[PDB]
């Protein structure tokens, strides 16, 4: 059941159009900082930050390089799903 | 062809433990009626029917053969995702 709950929560977290767009970009670029993500998506800074915040942990991993914060996919399942969808 | 919104909505519809169980079972048995599903999941008919109702047309296909109504997976993305999740 835990494998099912984990998986259900993963899908739930990814289940938003702009979040899938963010995950796809991270899949295409491996790792991106918030500024880069904003640039590509052309969305309000706060919109991107809100999405990244909700995704951090189960879908994305956060890494700090200097003063920049880099996001990348934190689970092989996420990458597999994004590939299947695009 | 499916849009970004269709993909997000697909994940949202599958984002429930028992729904993932249902999809996995259909993946393994190919065709199952409500009674077979209720007996496999060991859940109330009310609960199972609601999940099937929400999934029909987006995640699952409803089929009729004589007096029997059975479900199957006809969306490639759904099959692809359930395989990746196991």
Swiss-Prot record, chains A, B:
DNA-binding region residue numbers: 33-52
Keyword check for Repressor: yes
Pfam families in the record: HTH_5 (PF01022)
Keywords carried by this UniProt record: DNA-binding, Plasmid, Repressor, Transcription, Transcription regulation
Stored InterPro entries: ArsR-like_HTH, HTH_ArsR_DNA-bd_dom, Metal_resp_trans_reg, WH-like_DNA-bd_sf, WH_DNA-bd_sf
GO molecular function list: DNA binding; DNA-binding transcription factor activity
UniProt-listed Gene3D superfamilies: Winged helix-like DNA-binding domain superfamily/Winged helix DNA-binding domain
Signal peptide: none
HTH arsR-type domain: residues covered: 1-86
UniProt function note: Represses the expression of the pagA and atxA genes.
Protein name: Transcriptional repressor PagR
Gene: pagR
